């Protein structure tokens, strides 16, 4: 797996000129240092192992933060349960790495980290808490209260996590509708027709393929409500596995603006430097 | 034989050149039909061959000294090209490759350079605050194509949002520096070396076959890397022409005809 060695070379006086080329053809000149200067024989032992796709993508990255509360319910606005749409566009670090390529195909891994704290110092009484994380595929009914019938999880996957234990962990297969995920989509979902009564019959947003790509995650605490409020947050980490990619693209150069390819703010990424200054 | 002289022939049409550079095959793959072990729909496909696989010529554009660029998309640019367009609108699904030939000639005393790029899934940015708000009619220009701009001016129309693009040239219209665009298949037309560029494009998509009226899977961008100049005058301008020919086309799901509103 080591890189190719370097061959010894001597002086040259010949009719063949490897130094001249024409980039108009759309090809890169495959030169080596021995083709332009004298070189010695060197056995090469460096390798490219740490640069493969698996090694490049073998890291867990944060993608979302979910906040839930636990206090005796009133009629005011409360967060006894929360819902989050699965997507990787809420953060930029993993999005930029994925967008080097047009299509991809991989398994997925999830890890959940949970933390909690008090909000008032009046009592300081609370027992250990248990969290439920339920996955709601598209088309399934969604909860309307923290204790309705939907939480029976008859057929939806669910995780029960007890506070203070090791982070939960899950694996998921390739769940795409097509043969590969599409990071970019140049099209619409509906097309207006001359016979339509009004515009909305065909109106749609540019580059949006489907409404619910993967569903939502619903989070709650199963414990009843203690005399004092307790607040918690759940952090989700993502790691691709068994990765394949096609059709490379240039990387993003300006700040993201929404889930599309739009750009608003800076548009001036390069700094100043003299033409003849080292 | 020299690689500067080349001839192409498809259907009942022929093209000749005498100052070409060479031919490029994107990703080293030639167009082909669908295989049995890769099919998905079960209906019998239709493949007219000669009736659709031939060169069509778009309208010519004039390379001014202050022009910023032009862009097209496929198969959108070929909506009205006879039987290809008819088959596109009469069927639900479609698939085909393309061959792109760009023409531009000038004397030995002119100077300049054009960059020709073929981009898969060529998304473009909007012109207003509302994200992804451009409309179908404005996003599908036809053979007329579009243009780039030198800077981003935020739309402030009072009557209506106007729902159009606003591609910036040095950002390539999608938020990436133009310098890195050479990872895509490309060629350069340098007026002292050659006068045409040829690129062969296979079918690139995440599916074996997809709808043609909804999704565009290739984009063509032409940008002047070096501005045009002529001897001690500033009114000079020369034309540019683009020719395209579908290859290995097949259409599957038949129904009544579609009629988009533009």
């Amino acid at each position, epitope marked *: 797996d080591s890189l190719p060695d370097t061959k010894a070379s001597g002086p040259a006086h010949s009719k063949e000129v490897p130094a001249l080329t024409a980039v108009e053809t759309g090809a890169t000149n495959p030169l080596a240092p021995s083709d332009t200067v004298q070189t010695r024989h060197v056995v090469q032992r460096r390798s490219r192992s740490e640069s493969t796709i698996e090694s490049f993508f073998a890291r867990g990255a944060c993608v979302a933060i979910i*906040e839930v509360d636990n206090e005796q319910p009133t*009629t*005011r*606005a*409360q967060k006894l349960f929360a*819902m989050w749409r699965i997507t990787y566009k809420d953060t930029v670090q993993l999005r930029r790495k994925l967008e080097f390529f047009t299509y991809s195909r991989f398994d997925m891994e999830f890890t959940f980290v949970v933390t909690a704290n008090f909000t008032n110092a009046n009592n300081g009484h609370a027992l250990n808490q248990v969290y439920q994380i339920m996955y709601i595929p598209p088309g399934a009914p*969604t909860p309307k209260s923290w204790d309705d019938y939907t939480w029976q999880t008859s057929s939806n996957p669910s995780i029960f996590y007890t506070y203070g234990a090791a982070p939960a962990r899950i694996s998921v297969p390739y769940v795409g509708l097509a043969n590969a995920y599409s990071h970019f989509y140049d099209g619409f*979902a*509906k097309v207006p027709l001359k016979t339509d*009564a*009004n*515009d*909305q019959i065909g*109106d*749609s*947003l540019y580059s*949006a393929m*489907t*409404v619910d790509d993967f569903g939502v995650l619903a989070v709650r605490v199963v414990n009843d409500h203690n005399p004092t409020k307790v607040t918690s947050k759940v952090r989700i980490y993502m790691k691709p596995k068994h990765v394949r990619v096609w059709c490379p693209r240039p990387p993003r150069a300006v700040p993201y603006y*929404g889930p599309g390819v739009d750009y608003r703010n800076n548009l001036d990424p390069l700094s100043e430097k003299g033409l003849t200054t080292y | 034989y020299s690689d500067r002289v080349l001839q192409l022939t498809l259907g009942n049409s022929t093209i000749t050149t005498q100052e070409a550079a060479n031919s490029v095959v994107a990703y080293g793959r030639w167009p082909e039909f669908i295989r049995d072990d890769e099919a998905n729909p079960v209906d019998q496909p239709t493949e007219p061959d000669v009736a659709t696989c031939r060169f069509y010529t778009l309208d010519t554009v004039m390379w001014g000294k202050e022009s910023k660029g032009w862009w097209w998309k496929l198969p959108d640019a070929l909506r009205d090209m006879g039987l290809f367009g008819q088959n596109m609108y009469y069927h639900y699904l479609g698939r085909s490759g393309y061959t792109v030939h760009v023409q531009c000639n000038a004397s030995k005393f002119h100077q300049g350079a054009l960059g020709v790029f073929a981009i898969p899934e060529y998304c473009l940015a909007g012109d207003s*605050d*509302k*994200q*992804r*708000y451009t409309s179908y009619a404005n996003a599908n220009p036809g053979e007329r194509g579009g243009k780039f701009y030198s800077q981003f001016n935020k739309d402030n129309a009072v*009557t*209506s*949002p106007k729902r159009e693009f606003c591609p910036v040239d040095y950002l390539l219209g999608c938020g990436v520096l133009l310098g890195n665009a050479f990872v895509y298949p490309h060629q350069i037309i340098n007026l002292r070396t050659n006068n045409s560029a040829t690129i062969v494009l296979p079918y690139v998509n995440a599916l074996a076959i997809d709808s043609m009226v909804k999704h565009n899977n290739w984009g063509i961008a032409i940008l002047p890397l070096s501005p045009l100049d002529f001897a001690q005058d500033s009114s000079v301008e020369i034309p540019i022409t683009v020719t395209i020919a579908p290859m290995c086309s097949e259409f599957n799901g038949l129904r009544n005809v579609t009629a988009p509103k533009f």
Partner: antibody, heavy 129, light 109 residues
Framework: EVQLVESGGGLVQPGRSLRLSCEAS????????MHWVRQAPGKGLEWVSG????????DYADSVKGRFTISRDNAKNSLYLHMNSLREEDTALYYC??????????????????????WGQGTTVTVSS | SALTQPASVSGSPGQSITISCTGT?????????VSWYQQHPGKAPKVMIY???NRPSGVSNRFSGSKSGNTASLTISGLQAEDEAEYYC??????????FGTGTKVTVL
């Protein structure tokens, strides 16, 4: 079931700034459009501003364009209205309303504002020198 | 500009009354999003009709609506004393804004 509560109204001098607030409960506030409507004493209803389920889409009426601003905070189920360079003509009763938009026939988004089906009791703002 | 509505309409008990709201092609005449609201003095508006002809749950069948050309109409049948209130029309505009009507007051003789 569904409740909207407004607050922040008061008395201010011309040319100064004020902010209003609206809290919502009983429904998935994170996934609906919202509106602001004002009624001058003894006059008809006037549409002021509206925001869709995405903060990008955000519209204003000509009478307040360039002066007012609308924003939402899905983490607290709160809807805000920021007013600057107030005028005596702005004195009116302000309502917080919920749109029935979204939930179209699938592949559609940034829908037109269908209309309002729930109204709050409103808060009073008076501008006088 | 606000949609045009009549200043007021009068009718005797047991009769039927109609109210008209008019706009342009960038308005009622261009889209099907038209709704009607009812307001008693000192009360928040209540929705009566939406999408031109749909009634919300719990609304009496005595209310109905229709549209034609650039004009939309609200019809009240079996007029009663309690129907005395103000009514407004609303519509979506192609400039991405809602517009309210001038308003009409119903008087029961």
């Amino acid at each position: 079931e569904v409740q909207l509560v407004e607050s922040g109204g008061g008395l201010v001098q011309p040319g100064r700034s004020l902010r209003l607030s609206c809290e919502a409960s009983g429904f998935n506030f994170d996934d609906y459009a919202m509106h602001w409507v004002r009624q001058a004493p003894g006059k008809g209803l006037e549409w002021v501003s509206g925001i869709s389920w995405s903060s990008s889409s955000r519209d204003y009426a000509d009478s307040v364009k360039g002066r007012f601003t609308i924003s939402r905070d899905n983490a607290k189920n709160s809807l805000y209205l920021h007013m600057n360079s107030l005028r005596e003509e702005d004195t009116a009763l302000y309502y917080c309303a919920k749109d029935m938009s979204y939930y179209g026939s699938g592949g559609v988004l940034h829908y037109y504002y269908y209309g309002m089906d729930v109204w709050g009791q409103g808060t009073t703002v008076t501008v006088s020198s | 500009s606000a949609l045009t509505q009549p200043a007021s309409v009068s009718g005797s008990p047991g009769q039927s009354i109609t109210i008209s709201c008019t706009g342009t092609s960038s308005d009622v005449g261009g889209y099907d999003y038209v709704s009607w609201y009812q307001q008693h003095p000192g009360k928040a508006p209540k929705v009566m009709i939406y999408d031109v002809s749909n009634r919300p749950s719990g609304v009496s069948n005595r209310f109905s609506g229709s549209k034609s050309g650039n004009t939309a109409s609200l019809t009240i049948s079996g007029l009663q004393a309690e129907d005395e209130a103000e009514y407004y029309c609303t519509s979506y505009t192609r400039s991405s804004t809602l517009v309210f009507g001038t308003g009409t007051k119903v008087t029961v003789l």
